[PDB]
Amino acid sequence: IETVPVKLKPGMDGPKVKQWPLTEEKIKALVEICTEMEKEGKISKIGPENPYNTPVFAIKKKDSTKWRKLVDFRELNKRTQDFWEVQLGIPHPAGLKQKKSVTVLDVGDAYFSVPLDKDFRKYTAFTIPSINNETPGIRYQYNVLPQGWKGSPAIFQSSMTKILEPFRKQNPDIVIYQYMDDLYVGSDLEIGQHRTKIEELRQHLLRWGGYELHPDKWTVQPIVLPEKDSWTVNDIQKLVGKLNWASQIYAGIKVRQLSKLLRGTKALTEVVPLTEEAELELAENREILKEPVHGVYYDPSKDLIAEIQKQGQGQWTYQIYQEPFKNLKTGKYARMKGAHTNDVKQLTEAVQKIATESIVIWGKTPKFKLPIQKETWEAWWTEYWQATWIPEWEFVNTPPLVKLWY
C-alpha cells in the first residue's frame, strides 16, 4: 500500500512539547511496548536532529490489567490539516445516543497496518525518560498511522468500513461510530445479550487485526429553586441573585416583585413573609426553570465547551455549551469509590464521563474549563485516566457567586 500525502496547517510547525516525569512502572511498560513496536517496524529509533516531540505516558484499565501506551498528540492534532477539506472526515450517527447500551472498544491496533507518509513521520517523535536520569531520553517516531493521531481514523476510513460492513449488514439496528481509536457500539438488547454481540464484533475484527454506557439515564439537571415555609432576607437575596443570573439564560424572568420585599436596610436573619405578588412571581419562575430553554441548537461547525463545579459530598455539576448561556446540556456527575477521599480522581473521572457523553451525542469532545489549579491537576491526573483519547482543557478559578446548579 502507498502513503496518503499529509500536511500541517499553513504556517504551523510540528509539536515541541517536553516529556514529563514517569513512574518506574510506566517507564518499564513503555520500554517493553516500544522495543516490540520497534522490532515490528511500527516505530523507529531517532536522534536529536529531529526537533519535534510529544509527551508519552501509559494507562492501565483495571479489568484489562495490561498497560496501554498513550501518546498525547493533542498539539499535533491541532496543527494537522483538516480532513473535511480533503473529504476524509467521519460522519456522526444521530441514533447512537438513542440506544440503551453502548460499549467502547479500543481498535487502535488496526492503524498499525497502514504506513504513514514518510515526510510526515518526523512530527510523531516522542521520548522515553529515564529513572533518576541514568541515561538520556530514548527517541522514537512512527512509521505507521499512530494511535491518537486524528489523521489515522480519516486515512483508515475506507478500510474500516469494509471490515465493518458484514457486521452491520447482519445487524441493521446496531449503530457503530468511530471516534479516534475507539468504536462506540450501541444497541437496545438485554444487558447479557448486548454483551454477547459485542464479543461477536470483536472476533470479526480479530480475524483481520470497556464497560456498558447507558444514554437513556443521562438525566438533565435543571436550575432548582429552594422550597421553604418561611423565608429570611438572606434567603430572598440568595434567591434573587440566582434568578438574576438565570435571566441571562431563560426568557422573561422577573424579580422586581421580590426585590422590594427587601425594601429597607434589613437584618439578614429577619423573616420576611411572602406577598401574593411575590408567591406569584416565584412559582412562575419555578415553572420556567422546570422545562428547558427554547431556541438552542447544536452547531457542528463550532467547538463544544464544558464547565464543571465541585458541589461537595462527591457531587459534580456540569454544563456543555457552544455560545455562553445557551447550554446544550446541563448535568450532575456523582461517583462513589466508597472512600470519598479524592477530589482529583473524581474530577478526572467526571471529565472522562462528560467527554464520553459528548462523543456519543455529538461526535466530538468539549474543551473543558477545569475548577482546579493547573499544577495540582498535572501532579495526579494521569493516575486516573482510562480513555485512549484526551480532550482539550484549561484551568479556571471561579469562586461561586451563586450556587446556580444546586
Next chain:
Amino acid sequence: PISPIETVPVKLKPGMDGPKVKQWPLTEEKIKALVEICTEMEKEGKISKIGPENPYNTPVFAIKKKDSTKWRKVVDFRELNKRTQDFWEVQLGIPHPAGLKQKKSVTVLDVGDAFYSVPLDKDFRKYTAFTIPSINNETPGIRYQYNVLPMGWKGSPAIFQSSMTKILEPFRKQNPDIVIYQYMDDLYVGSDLEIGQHRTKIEELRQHLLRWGFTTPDKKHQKEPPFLWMGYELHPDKWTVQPIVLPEKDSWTVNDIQKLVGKLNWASQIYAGIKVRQLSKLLRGTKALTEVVPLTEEAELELAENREILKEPVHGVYYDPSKDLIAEIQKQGQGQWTYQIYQEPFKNLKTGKYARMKGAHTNDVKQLTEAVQKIATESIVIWGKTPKFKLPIQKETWEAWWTEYWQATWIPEWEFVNTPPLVKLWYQLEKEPIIGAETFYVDGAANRETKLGKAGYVTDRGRQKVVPLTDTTNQKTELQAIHLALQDSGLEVNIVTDSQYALGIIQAQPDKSESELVSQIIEQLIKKEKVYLAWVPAHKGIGGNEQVDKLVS
C-alpha cells in the same frame, strides 16, 4: 581517535546561510596553546585546512580546564548557532546521588576528548570555518574547518550524547546487572560482582569503547572510594557534597547576593533548614549588578543561621528499593518550607526547600499543597514513585479545607506529625448568617478617569459611613468598603457586598497577600469571632445594597 559511528545529518534553518565574522586578538600563551591543539588536531584528523572559496568564518578562543594545566579550545559560534536547526535535547535531567542504590563495586570513568572523537556531518563541516590569529599583527591567520563536534556549537552536546547512547547500548543489553549512569562523557559503573569480576567487566567496557574511538585515560579512571561524581563524593555507605564556600564580604553587590543565594540553594539539597527569603528580598527593585546593597537586619540573621547550619557535617544515604520513601515537611515562616526525604529515621536521602510565592493572595494550606506537589515530582524523577508524607497539619484542618474550598484538591497518603508551627486555617467564613450580629451593606465605587473613589456602608442597626479615597481603583474601593465594615463591627458580623472580585479573594481564606490592603483585611478576619459574607447583584435596587449604593454616590 575518531569514532567510525555514522554522522548525524544536520541542517541550517531554512533561508539561512553560514556565519561570516572576523577573529579578535588573543594572547601569546593562548595562541601557542591553540597551535599545539590545532596543528595536532589536524594531525589527528580533527580539523582540515581550507581556503578562500569557503566564505564562512567564526572566531576562536581558549579557557582553562580543571584538569591541571590543560586548555580547552572553544569557538564563538553564536552566529552559526542562531542559524543552525533546532534539536530535541535528550538530556532530560540531572542524576542525583540519593537515587543510587548501594553497590558492591563502583568505577567512575571519563572519555578523553569526547566531542573530538565524534565525526561531524560532512556537508555541514564547511559552516564551521574558523581562523587561528597567532599574535594577530604578524601574518593573516590559517583557515580550518571542523571534521568533528566543535565545543561551542549548539548541536554538539545532543549529537555526542546520542552517539554515546548508541555505543553503550551492545554493552547495556549484554550486562543488565551493571548500572551505567551516563552523564555527557562521564560514566559511573556499579555492580554487585566481586571486584575481580567487576574489573573484568570494566576492562571489557573500556575495550568496546576504544573500538568505537572513545579512550578512557587513566587519570580520569577512579577505582577507589570516595568517587568524585557530579559534584558529590560517593562513599560505600554515604555521600556528601563537595565543599561549599560561601562568599564573605563587608560590602555586598547585587551580584554577590545573587551568588550567595545560588550557593545556598545548591546546599539545600543536603543541608536541612536553609532559608533564602530575606537575602533574596535584597535583590528586589535593584537596577544594576554592581549596585551596593546593605544587608538588612533580617538578612544578616538569615545569613548567620545558614552559616551555622553549613558548619555542621552532613551526609545523605543511598536508596533502598525494599523500604518505603518518606517525606516530612516543616513550616519556616513567610511562605518558606523545608523538607527531608528518608527511609530510616535520621538517615536522610536528601533534603530540600520550597519557598515560591504563587499568586497575589494565598494561604499556608495551599502552599503546603504546592510543597507536596514539588516533592512528589522530584520523587518521581529520582526514584520512580512518590513517598508517604508526614505533614504538620491536622486531619480536621485538611478536611475543613477541601470541603469548604471550591476547587478540587488533594494530598496523597499522609500522617499527621506534631512539629509546630502547625499549618492551619486562620479563619472560616460562616455558612449561614449569624443571628444577633449586625448586618453591613458595603459598597465602594471609583471613577476610572479620576482615580478618586469612595467606600461606605449602611447597617440594619442604622450605622452609616462614607470615606473618600484618592488614587484608587474600582476593585480597591470594594476591598476598602469591606475593610471598613470589619473595622467598625463587633466580633460577629454579617457583610453583604456586590463585588464578586472581593468575595472571590476572601472566600478562598487567604492568610497572606502581596497587597497591603488585602493583608489588613486578613488580620481583621483573623481577629473576628464569626463572619458571614454574602453577595448580591449591583444596581438592582435590593434593600440595603441599594441604600449604600445611593450613599456612595
Next chain:
DNA sequence: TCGCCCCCCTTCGGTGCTTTGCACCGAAGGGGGGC
C-alpha cells in the same frame, strides 16, 4: 567574548475578562550545579 541540561528568585510582557486593573502564566534576566 562558547555549548547543552536541571534547580531557584525576580522581572516583564502577553492574554482575557460580560475588565478599564487584575490575576495568571511563560519566557528571560540573574545566580547555583553538572559535563
